[PDB]
């Protein structure tokens, strides 16, 4: 009706004003400023360890706070906690639903979370007097499939589902403290800020949104992509984050600038990006692709600094340790490989 | 030498035990067929669910027939993009389908002259020619044959398929809709579409599922071992 058309015109005017403001704040591209920096050599990451034991496609992984314990889910109905230093298996968590699509590790090292098509985020307790891993709480309420879970503390977890919503949970109560709405498509990946007050979520609508955890309101929207955003990761500094799409391009956005900074793409690269993770210093933007290898990107020069090709199938997981010691890559071949830079 | 402390050796033993448990669980899981029930909204899904046997997600109904324990996955509750979760079902041995015969005369809820049978045909196209399922055999079950028999007596199938130049009897009509749902396949060389009309009884249909999965596992094992 007339009111709907008027509201649509008002929204279009607001979008035009926002675009004009972003253009006005755009003076020089990030490449020109970093044109004079010394470029990195050829990163020659080599497989230092391999981790076998899974019997199906590994879908997610996460590193612990101590940079030594890692947890991976592989749609075999198992959540294996590995000791990266000695390849030994600390635990083997049996899963009620074998369609786990995400996994997480609490920063305190006491809990591990998982979820999938069951619409349920299962919080597991590792430090139990009984010695076995039990289900502390089964968070329910999401209509769509869970895509990624991350721990804020031992009593709070933020989860993104396929019902175009992101939710913050209280594990003790089991109720959704705050529900984040605003996405038109399915939310596929989220990354928490180092200071744990904000988090970005990438959705199928080719947009990235910043949320305030306490306020429960979307602060900014980031567009520019042409396909679904399947990965996201904050810069260590917390003032920027990188996105992964199915259009074979990884993009870095700045929070304060509220606009695009640099596009990471190559002509020979045609497959999408599944996972993205920055390094300790933020110079390397590690990204896993579907062409069976993970490519190392110069986060300040858009130059391919190396290739991590050791997998026989699609790379579905990635993670850089808290201390920057090593990187971990999970792929559908039921293999996790730990990589490190040769001295 | 060993260079392993007492705790390191004990941790190695615990890791070996966990690996043994994983191997045993994988052995149990491999000898267990997985079926994915896809289909329209109410295209005989319930009847299939009844005869073969918290959150709006995957419903896993497990049923056994002559030591061939199955796990049949109803995923008709995920109201999300299919291309974002259909990649989880890669090792599925069947993509069991349920198509309603009465949909030929009915129209979709959002009435725009969109035949429900045509919608089922459209759904079949996106699953029979999907990029992932290149060696998965569909067990398409043409449901509600009785209603089709009654409805074909008065309502002509021409309103559903204009080109159809047969009679108005169940025989020719069914033969034609079965042919139409079977010709959408573009990779007949690799996979097959085992068709079957759902019987009123709840005892002979599951036999067809048994037979179809037996044939497909035979073919899978044979090609994996290597004969073609």
């Amino acid at each position: 009706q007339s009111e709907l058309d008027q509201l649509r015109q008002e929204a279009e005017q607001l979008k035009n004003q926002i675009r004009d403001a972003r253009k006005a704040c755009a003076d020089a591209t990030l490449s020109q400023i970093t044109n004079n920096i010394d470029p990195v050599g050829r990163i020659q990451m080599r497989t230092r360890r391999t981790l076998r034991g899974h019997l199906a496609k590994i879908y997610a992984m996460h590193w612990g706070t101590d940079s030594r314990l890692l947890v991976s889910a592989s749609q075999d109905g198992k959540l294996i906690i590995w000791d990266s230093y000695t390849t030994n298996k600390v635990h083997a968590i049996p899963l009620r639903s074998s369609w786990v699509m995400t996994c997480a590790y609490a920063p305190s090292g006491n809990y591990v979370a998982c979820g999938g098509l069951d619409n349920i985020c299962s919080i597991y307790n590792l430090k139990t007097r009984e010695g076995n891993v039990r289900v502390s709480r089964e968070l329910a309420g999401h209509t769509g499939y869970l895509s990624c879970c991350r721990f804020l503390d031992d009593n709070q977890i933020v989860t993104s589902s396929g019902d175009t919503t992101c939710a913050l949970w209280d594990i003790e109560t089991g109720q959704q403290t705050t529900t984040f709405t605003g996405h038109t498509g399915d939310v596929m990946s989220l990354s928490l800020a180092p200071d744990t007050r904000l988090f970005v979520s990438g959705a199928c609508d080719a947009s990235a949104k910043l949320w305030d955890v306490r306020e429960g309101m979307c602060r900014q929207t980031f567009t520019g992509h042409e396909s679904d955003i399947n990965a996201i990761c904050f810069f260590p500094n917390g003032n920027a984050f990188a996105t992964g799409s199915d259009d074979a391009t990884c993009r870095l956005f700045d929070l304060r600038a509220d606009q695009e900074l640099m596009t990471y793409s190559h002509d020979n690269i045609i497959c999408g990006i599944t996972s993205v993770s920055f390094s300790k210093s933020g110079r390397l933007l590690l990204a896993g692709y579907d062409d069976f290898n993970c490519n190392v990107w110069d986060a300040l020069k858009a130059d391919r600094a190396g290739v991590l090709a050791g997998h026989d199938n699609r790379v579905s997981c990635l993670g850089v340790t808290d201390d920057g010691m090593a990187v971990a890559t999970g792929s559908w071949d039921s293999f996790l490989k730990i990589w490190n830079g040769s001295s | 030498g060993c260079t392993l402390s007492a705790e390191d050796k004990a941790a190695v033993e615990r890791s070996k035990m966990i690996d043994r448990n994983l191997r045993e669980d994988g052995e149990k899981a491999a000898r267990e067929v997985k079926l994915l029930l896809l289909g329209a909204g109410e295209s005989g899904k319930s009847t299939i669910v009844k005869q073969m046997k918290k959150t709006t997600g995957i419903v896993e109904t497990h049923f056994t027939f002559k030591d061939l324990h199955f796990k049949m996955f109803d995923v008709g509750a995920q109201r999300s993009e299919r291309k974002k979760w259909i990649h989880c079902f890669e090792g599925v041995t069947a993509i069991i389908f349920c198509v309603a015969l009465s949909d030929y005369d009915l129209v979709l809820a959002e009435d725009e002259e969109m035949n429900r049978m045509h919608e089922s045909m459209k759904l079949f196209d996106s699953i029979c020619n999907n990029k992932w399922f290149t060696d998965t055999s569909i067990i398409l079950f043409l449901n509600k044959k009785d209603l089709f028999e009654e409805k074909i007596k008065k309502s002509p199938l021409t309103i559903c398929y204009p080109e159809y130049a047969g009679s108005n009897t169940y025989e020719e009509a069914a033969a034609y809709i079965q042919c139409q749902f079977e010709d959408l396949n573009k990779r007949k060389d690799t996979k097959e579409i085992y068709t079957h009309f759902t019987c009123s009884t709840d005892t002979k249909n599951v036999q067809f599922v048994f037979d179809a999965v037996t044939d497909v596992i035979i073919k899978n094992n044979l090609k994996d071992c290597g004969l073609f």
Epitope: D83, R129, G131 | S5, E13, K16, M17
Partner: single-chain antibody, 232 residues
Amino acid sequence: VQLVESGGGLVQPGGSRKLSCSASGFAFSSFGMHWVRQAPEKGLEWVAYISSGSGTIYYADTVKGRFTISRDDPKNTLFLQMTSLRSEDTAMYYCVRSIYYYGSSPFDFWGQGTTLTVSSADIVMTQATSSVPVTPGESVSISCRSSKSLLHSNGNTYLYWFLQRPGQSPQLLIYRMSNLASGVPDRFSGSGSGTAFTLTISRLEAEDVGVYYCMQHLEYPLTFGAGTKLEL
């Protein structure tokens, strides 16, 4: 978590006996079991150990061959088949639980213990002090020394601290020389470099009087210290 043991009593020397430890409230299969003996008015002494899944079984030098340790995972029971008993075996035997992994807490739970009465390369542990008078509210320290450095190449130091309250089974206080167990207050702390290890009890009060034992876990023939007695 609860362990009860039975089968003890007066036995004629040269006979045989069978001790049983009943497990309840925890996953007995994933846990390794130990037997620790304590002679009357003497120190602890390790007896046997069976790994989870019965993969490896070790024994002490003084009891090799005679003692037979086995477990029955389905029924949650630990056994100790004992034959040819001498006068030196008079002690009250304990059933000790210990799981081993990264971050694990070995020797965490100690059973009540059944009483039994009859009518080298091992890392020697020395506790120079034997009796330290204490006063409530004061901070006391206990020293324990080893012949061989316990610091392994992997960064771990395998020395454990135990507390035996009078008439009670010992409870774990500090494992691996720095980590505090679960349920023990923060007032307990330990340190040391590679041979001299000290445990500091800041703001000592009641329920802290007892005998403190230091044990190594580098080489499997574990040796317990003489033990220090705190007098109030």
